[PDB]
Write an enzyme that holds these catalytic residues in place. Sequence first.
Site, PDB file in Angstrom:
ATOM      1  N   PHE B 231       8.239  21.652  28.722  1.00 30.47           N
ATOM      2  CA  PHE B 231       7.758  21.306  27.645  1.00 30.47           C
ATOM      3  C   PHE B 231       8.702  21.219  26.225  1.00 30.47           C
ATOM      4  CE2 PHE B 231       4.429  23.855  29.726  1.00 30.47           C
ATOM      5  CZ  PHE B 231       3.613  22.993  30.342  1.00 30.47           C
TER       6      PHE B 231
ATOM      7  N   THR E 111     -11.078  19.735  31.436  1.00 35.17           N
ATOM      8  CA  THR E 111     -10.028  18.861  31.535  1.00 35.17           C
ATOM      9  C   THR E 111      -8.674  19.181  31.144  1.00 35.17           C
ATOM     10  OG1 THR E 111     -10.484  17.943  29.345  1.00 35.17           O
ATOM     11  CG2 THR E 111     -11.510  16.791  31.000  1.00 35.17           C
ATOM     12  N   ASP E 112      -7.682  18.426  31.597  1.00 35.82           N
ATOM     13  CA  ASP E 112      -6.319  18.758  31.122  1.00 35.82           C
ATOM     14  C   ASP E 112      -5.812  18.584  29.967  1.00 35.82           C
ATOM     15  OD1 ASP E 112      -6.777  19.232  33.992  1.00 35.82           O
ATOM     16  OD2 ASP E 112      -4.914  18.041  34.768  1.00 35.82           O
ATOM     17  N   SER E 137      -1.619  16.784  26.056  1.00 36.58           N
ATOM     18  CA  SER E 137      -1.701  16.562  27.693  1.00 36.58           C
ATOM     19  C   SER E 137      -0.772  17.569  28.295  1.00 36.58           C
ATOM     20  CB  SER E 137      -0.985  15.037  27.919  1.00 36.58           C
ATOM     21  OG  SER E 137      -0.849  14.563  29.231  1.00 36.58           O
ATOM     22  N   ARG E 138      -1.544  18.314  29.106  1.00 37.69           N
ATOM     23  CA  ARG E 138      -1.084  19.308  29.981  1.00 37.69           C
ATOM     24  C   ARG E 138       0.209  19.039  30.772  1.00 37.69           C
ATOM     25  NH1 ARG E 138      -4.856  23.732  29.005  1.00 37.69           N
ATOM     26  NH2 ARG E 138      -6.451  22.005  28.366  1.00 37.69           N
TER      27      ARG E 138
END
Lengths: 45, 283, 281, 281, 138, 272
Positions: B231, E111-112, E137-138
């Site tokens: 990330f 949800t992700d 957003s994962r």
Amino acid sequence: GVRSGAGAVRDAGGAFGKKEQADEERYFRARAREQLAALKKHHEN
Amino acid sequence: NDLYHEMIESGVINLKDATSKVALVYGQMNEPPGARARVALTGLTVAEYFRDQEGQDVLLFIDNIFRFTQAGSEVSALLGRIPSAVGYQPTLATDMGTMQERITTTKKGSITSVQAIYVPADDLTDPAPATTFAHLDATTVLSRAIAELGIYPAVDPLDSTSRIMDPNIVGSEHYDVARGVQKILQDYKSLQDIIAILGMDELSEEDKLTVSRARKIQRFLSQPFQVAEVFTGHLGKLVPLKETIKGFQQILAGEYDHLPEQAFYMVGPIEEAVAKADKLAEE
Amino acid sequence: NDLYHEMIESGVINLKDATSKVALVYGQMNEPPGARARVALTGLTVAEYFRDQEGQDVLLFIDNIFRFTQAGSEVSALLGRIPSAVGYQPTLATDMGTMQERITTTKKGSITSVQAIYVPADDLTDPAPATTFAHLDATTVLSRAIAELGIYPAVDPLDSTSRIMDPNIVGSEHYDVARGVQKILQDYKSLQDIIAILGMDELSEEDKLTVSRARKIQRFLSQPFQVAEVFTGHLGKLVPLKETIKGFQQILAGEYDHLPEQAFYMVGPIEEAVAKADKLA
Amino acid sequence: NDLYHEMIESGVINLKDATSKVALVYGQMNEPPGARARVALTGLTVAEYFRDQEGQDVLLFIDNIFRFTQAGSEVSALLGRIPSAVGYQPTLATDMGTMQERITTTKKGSITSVQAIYVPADDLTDPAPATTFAHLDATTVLSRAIAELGIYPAVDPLDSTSRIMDPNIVGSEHYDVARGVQKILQDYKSLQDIIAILGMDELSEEDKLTVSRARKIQRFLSQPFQVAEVFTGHLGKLVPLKETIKGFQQILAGEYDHLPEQAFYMVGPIEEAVAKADKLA
Amino acid sequence: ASDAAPLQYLAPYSGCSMGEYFRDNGKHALIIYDDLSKQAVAYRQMSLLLRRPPGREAYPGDVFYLHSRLLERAAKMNDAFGGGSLTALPVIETQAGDVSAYIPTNVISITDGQIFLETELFYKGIRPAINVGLSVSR
Amino acid sequence: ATLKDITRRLKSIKNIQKITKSMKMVAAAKYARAERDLKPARVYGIGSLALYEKADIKVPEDKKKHLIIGVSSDRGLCGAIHSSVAKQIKSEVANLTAAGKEVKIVGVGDKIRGILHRTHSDQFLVTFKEVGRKPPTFGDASVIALELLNSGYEFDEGSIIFNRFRSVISYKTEEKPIFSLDTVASAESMSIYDDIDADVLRNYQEYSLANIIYYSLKESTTSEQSARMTAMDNASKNASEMIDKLTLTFNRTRQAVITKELIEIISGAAAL
């Protein structure tokens, strides 16, 4: 009885919290710029 | 699946030969509530075997333990129980304690349990996370406000607690550094309200230094993670304890009041902070 | 137990002869909710006997009405009755009415109830304090600030209100005197704010005289009590209503503006105030 | 009764020959809950006949449609259903959808329906006024806070939405003007807190200009109504679309940044605003 | 809305199966549930009419399960299973931006990632009103 | 909104109210100090202006240059002090520029620089800061006058604008001319005055410029402190009003939450 605490202005996330965050960021951006200039001048030595 | 593949490629789980070191018990959210209310028991039972039958130390990672309570609540209504507060089962504390007391360090062996606890709506006064506080020695509260500032991990410095945080255990220096960090952050919280109305430029010269030190400490608490390289992109860091103590003590003493606050963001040891400061100065 | 022994010391209840003046009806917290739900009715029946069979102006005390409401709610909950808003019994209004309506003035006598009130969550709009206020005819509030000021009794002169404070009930003179006293006290509050901010020389002569008169009034509200004679050594005074009205009217008229401030502290009738002023210098 | 007599007087209903244009169905609040839950269906059935079997364009005015849901809630308690949130019936969305989806424009004809939806306790999150949003193309949300300021109609400009508000349908100029008005109103509402606490003098010059323009827009949204003439005494005004578009575009541009705020209150076209500004010269 | 509550409760699963057909056959599919809050309302009506005890906000105890067993069927198969996929785009309606409500919190936890749409940003001219500060957003 | 949002907003407004009240008390103390210090400053300024009061020292005709001294502070929250002085200086600049006279402005307050920098950026001669953080004194005024002379802008005609303190609630944005030029100092009245010379009158005029700068600074700081106190009091009152309204709303929401949760529990128990 309902009471309050310290640092509750930013917790509410209202106009005043955003105002305080923006003011702090704008002040410390200038302070970081000044410190970077001073550090560069020192490193030139 | 991501964890399974990561541990396969990290050598922790080896399919070819029997040198694996991690067992896996998985009941996911697609399972019925009956299944999600028992997978924690299965995992802690494997841990119990590794603790009692064999004298070795055990690591028990649970994620997420709240689903056990949530599954119990889901089955409670059909089980024929009058709902408790916020719609939980009346036996919430009883079953949670029955599960948690099994995950303890005995004289035969020691189980180090790292349980992830989901807090609904970020409300720690909810019964499910509230009851878990009495069951944990060290607690780490990740707050959304800190995460939104970009500080990762989002650990709340003024909410995390540990039983071993004591001068007779961690030493006088460590306790003093930690308490000074917490005190200066609390004072920063107090001063933020004044800054909201008065304005930062209108503050005195004394408390401006405190605010700057608090900003530096907040940024220096942040740390890149190896698992989080995908990330942020930063290289993962692992700072030793003495390095953390020395760095935070130096920041408290004001030894780095001449460095910009940006230099302390997403760095490891304080030497990396000064390196980043001079690199930014070079540009 | 503390109240029992304090009353014994005060002499309102005597253990030797039949000169006692208080009949105690205690429902302790360790008793079941049904007991606390009917202790008020027990005391009210004791008062009703005096009102009806003796024609006396009885004085009933309930300490406090909020615990009566709470006991009623607990009793209703134990009987499996669906609770009302903020978790109170459905029969809150009816139970409160059945308790309060027996506190009235019949032709034989009357019963006057001085009920202590605890406001839950400091919310005057909660069902229990609202239902209680529905039956109140006056309020007396004991402010800690007034006690720290040294005025006993600590009744707040501004926050205390009475429904019968109307010219048609207490007379034109009484209403005018009370309204003037309250107005002078409010003006004193404003001038005290000004003195806190600005200097005492900023205000005019009129403001200074109003401040002096208001200080004299708020020290005249203090009164020695017979029940406290044994402690403070100051004789208690039972000031009649006419004397109170006349004294406060004369104070408002500026008649005793030359007397010092302490001349009116802890005295009965205004004659005792002028006597104390004579004692000073 | 007033609507019936107004339509008789205006001639929309004639008691002599078959030239009447409007049919009336009335189940009122005096009716039992069973009647109030089906009168809307009666009016809807009449509208359905006029739409389908005659191929006509029909207007279906319903007031109030929330009472249908309230009647359903009243009857479902007796029908033996486990109550849903806020004590409503579990079949709150099913019956509402069954009633509403019949009020639609088919290929046979068009039903231009205007429905008044009561909002209990001014709570738009209540299930009855919340589930009905999905059944509406154009939504007009009145607010009590706006009505307190005297801005009639009390339409909330930041809560009322329409489906045809699109540059392809309503035109590019109309969409741009509407979006600019909404943007400046939202900016003013965001600034309201700082104005409320600190004061107007703490804002920037551009912020002051935005506040002034937004307040002028709020005043200019108000419009007198012909049916409300007997109330305020101001003649009702019926502005065309182009005139109000031009007026709001001019206000946003800044041509009227010198007129007072009150010049835009209870006026129609912007010409009336400019002819009212010079009256109080 | 005119359709019976069981149909509204069964609709997401029907589309999920239709997407799963593509997913298990090497093809990529996208499924949009618009909106799962009304499906939750329909399921609540079904359960309450079935005399099942109500829970939080009158919803059944297994409202979390109702969506979890649905959204967990959105997966990315590997090459051993054809390599297909099923991307899911659930939609949740929040009353007055109360993102801390029961069903919104359940769906967020399931949800992700979340795409927060805010009316304040919508009226300020930011359209689409995607709050990039909170949208993740994962 | 929900209970949590109401609680957060109420606590934030409570903190804001406390801060505003504390600032009101601080401004009251500073106003008292400024009021005490104003009297000798008032006498000094009146004495400095007495010579030009008793002599018809008026500008003969149009002059190419003109310096405007806008005295203000750096702090905000002062109400309409800075707004009034900015309006006055803008009006004076426009009026004097309409006559084709070169206009230059010196602002001792950073707020004046910020307000006028959007339009009158070029007209700035020398900007000063750190005004109002500490009580003004003659040393700062002397430094300002020294750098005003050292600026190299030989303004033939000059003026100064400041907010004169009238009362605790009332102030007046006053304009006072400054005849700093030596030639404009000499007039028909200087004939009666002895030992006028040229250099002596020049030094006297420079000292009078310093004196009027100091007097304007004292008047401006007194007015600023009074207005700060008044504005903080108004903000505290507004915050208290909002606090009570939100307290009523919070009580309603708390009761509603309790009732709703109890109704849910009762319905769940009954449906069993």
